[PDB]
Ligand binder design. Structure first.
Ligand SMILES: Nc1ncnc2c1ncn2[C@@H]1O[C@H](COP(=O)(O)O)[C@@H](O)[C@H]1O
Ligand SMILES: Nc1ncnc2c1ncn2[C@@H]1O[C@H](COP(=O)(O)O)[C@@H](O)[C@H]1O
Ligand SMILES: [Zn+2]
Ligand SMILES: [Zn+2]
Lengths: 515, 266
């Protein structure tokens, strides 16, 4: 239950097994369903768009993100007066962030249910008047209290997000910047261009005293100095990083953090939610924009809409193609078929829709594309004229190419998106169930022993066990490190992932003795 | 055993097939009160014909996604209703008479009903059902309104529904194909692939029909259950105890007689 075992390619050039204790809180926080979903999304991402060389780097990054999330969850878990009450309230919002997010979705549907009882009258209950019409009389007070409650809940959602999810954003940003500083020399040798807005903005935090505040590595500045001093000037590097080399013998940081947060998509969405909730008090119908949150909420709806967004570039390109081809038909009509576009039944005021190129394009794009039979179901009958056969060819080509072919292209794009997403999921599942994540040896090898692959993935090469070992190493002070622990610790500090068993396992190595 | 009988009655009355047959009997009884209640028995073709049940499995396979897409259509049509009720109220007069205007969007409930009904059952959307926008100051806004309705509701969402059905057809087909492929390329009992047994001609067929026939395992369970324990032989009693303990290690997992004694069979 607590005996966590891994296999690492050791210093002796042989696969060896390491044993460590897994904490119960860490085990429960791993079994948490949000963490399970994070793991599932990571696995899908890697298997779908990943590489063999990049896989271990991505896996270690995912483990580090998970470890930080576990620490945040432990901080917010259930345990002068102003500070003690503030901490409890802020932690309460973080533990209940998703309940508030679901509470705001119920308040959006509750409010929009009231709005269906609206009416418009010229006379008060020329400026028109809007009012709720209900005999119960409780709908209007319910609407008022529900709008106030909804704005309150949106604000609480923003605060809970800032206390829950913003730390991970800052941790990711700091660790990426530290890695670019140390193992790439980005601001020392590379100096990113103006096109990298993120790289240009990150220059603010280098000089700050508390540059690492969420990322656990408190020796990043020392390591960057030690690596790049002899090559780029110790005094220059110290001035760049805001570190006093003589002592070796935060408004700027806060502004940087605010920029990082305000460039975050989820925070921007929550701010938009709060803004529209504030405008819902100026006009009640602005609360209808919160119904759009069902997409960002319900996972079923998000999966359904992924079929639309998967080929979104092809969909907009096909719409532009439809616009071009309807322009071509408009050219042909405006030059040869102008007389058939009279939309006025009166014999005194002809309402020609194709005596102008802009008007004929608007008429085509609107009515000939929304019509079932094309533009021939909307313009004058061609029979009897000299251009009858030309008009028939015109209408039938419009019907075939625009009504049939192009709408078929759009619908086929959606259907192909459904099929492609299904087979992506199937391929990820097949890879995971037929191959090992850590070593890549197929299940056929392990299945020689009954339940061999399940035993291998649950005991020997459990990626969860590797994550728990990283937690163990990070938490354990280096003084108490054992030999193999220090070997793996140095390989992790150098960002070298050769200690992961690649294509070799304990059974494969010692099958001779296990026979 | 009144308590046992009441328990059995509860178990039966919570059974879906028995409940369906009771519903059939109830509607047949009501067919004597009104003859047209016998039309509900035509629905039994689905629970009957296997072809019809397979066809309807395409509809029910993505049923959750279908109802979610219907709810999404309802939400987006509500949004269009909001925009119409606030900016396009004058185009929703459905009365040709010049004395009694039958406005369909002076009320939020009425405009939602009008949208959900006619703009979704219309081929061109709500612009094929409301007043022509040409000549008004809001002409371009109304054109954008109608064309977005046509693209998003008429085209995109109905395409989502039809794609859900088509993907259900394909998914069910490939499920059947994968089951057939697994059965014809691997052994049910031991899991050793047909490639191993095919070294001997007709080796896999011989293995599945003679050596590891799941039907033979079923018949052996019949044999063990029917045979009184006094007459059990040694291996029979071994398997009997393993079956009483619900331990299934006596099934050959990854090993077979040929694999074990290939040295002597050579
Ligand atoms: N190195 C690995 N560690 C853990 N599970 C693995 C590994 N490689 C493949 N798997 C598979 O991943 C799945 C884990 O199930 P789940 O935790 O529900 O995603 C099982 O099918 C395992 O056989
Ligand atoms: N252990 C097994 N026992 C019997 N049939 C098996 C077994 N493993 C695979 N099969 C296959 O199952 C199919 C039996 O055909 P049927 O009885 O019509 O379903 C054949 O393709 C067999 O090769
Ligand atoms: Zn492995
Ligand atoms: Zn077999």
């Amino acid at each position: 239950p607590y005996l966590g075992r891994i296999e690492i390619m050791g210093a002796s050039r042989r696969i060896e097994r390491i044993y460590f204790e897994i904490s119960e809180t860490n085990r429960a926080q791993w079994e948490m369903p949000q963490v399970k979903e994070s793991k599932r999304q990571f696995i899908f991402d890697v298997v779908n768009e990943g590489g063999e060389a990049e896989k271990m780097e991505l896996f270690v990054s995912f483990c580090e993100d998970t470890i930080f999330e576990m620490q945040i969850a432990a901080q917010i878990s259930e345990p002068g007066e102003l500070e003690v009450q503030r901490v409890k309230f802020l932690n309460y919002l973080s533990r209940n962030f998703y309940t508030l997010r679901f509470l705001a979705l119920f308040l959006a549907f509750a409010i929009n249910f009231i709005l269906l009882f609206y009416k418009v009258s010229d006379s008060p209950p020329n400026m028109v008047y809007y009012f709720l019409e209900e005999s119960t009389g409780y709908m209007e007070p319910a609407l008022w209290c529900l709008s106030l409650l909804h704005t309150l809940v949106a604000f609480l959602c923003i605060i809970g997000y800032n206390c829950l999810k913003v730390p991970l954003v800052i941790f990711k940003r700091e660790k990426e910047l530290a890695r670019k500083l140390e193992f790439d020399g980005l601001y020392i040798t590379e100096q990113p261009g103006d096109d990298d807005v993120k790289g240009q903005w990150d220059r603010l935090v280098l000089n700050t005293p508390s540059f690492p505040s969420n990322y656990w590595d408190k020796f990043v500045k020392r390591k960057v100095l030690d690596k790049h001093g002899d090559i780029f000037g110790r005094e220059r590097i110290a001035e760049l990083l805001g570190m006093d080399l003589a002592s070796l013998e935060d408004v700027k940081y806060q502004i940087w953090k605010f920029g990082v947060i305000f460039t975050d998509n989820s925070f921007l969405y929550l701010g938009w939610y709060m803004v529209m909730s504030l405008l819902g008090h100026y006009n009640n119908f602005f609360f209808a924009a919160h119904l759009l949150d069902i997409a960002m909420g319900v996972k079923t709806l998000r999966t359904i809409l992924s079929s639309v967004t998967h080929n979104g570039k092809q969909l907009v390109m096909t719409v532009g193609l439809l616009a071009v081809v309807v322009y071509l038909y408009t050219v042909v009509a405006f030059n040869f078929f102008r007389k058939f576009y009279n939309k006025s039944e009166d014999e005194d005021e002809p309402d020609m829709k194709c005596d102008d190129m802009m008007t004929c394009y608007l008429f085509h794009m609107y009515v000939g594309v929304r019509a079932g039979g094309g533009i021939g179901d909307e313009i004058e009958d061609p029979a009897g004229d000299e251009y009858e056969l030309y008009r028939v060819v015109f209408d039938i080509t419009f019907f075939f190419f625009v009504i049939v072919i192009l709408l078929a292209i759009i619908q086929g794009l959606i259907i192909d998106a459904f099929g492609e997403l299904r087979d992506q999921q199937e391929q990820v599942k097949e890879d995971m169930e037929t191959k090992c994540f850590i070593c890549g040896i197929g299940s056929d090898y392990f299945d020689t022993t009954p339940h061999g692959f399940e035993t291998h993935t649950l005991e020997e090469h459990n990626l969860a066990n590797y994550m728990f070992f990283l937690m163990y190493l990070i938490n354990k002070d280096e003084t108490e490190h054992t030999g193999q622990e220090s070997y793996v610790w140095k390989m992790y500090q150098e960002r070298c992932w050769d200690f992961f068993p690649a294509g070799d396992c304990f059974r494969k190595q010692y099958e001779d003795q296990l026979s």
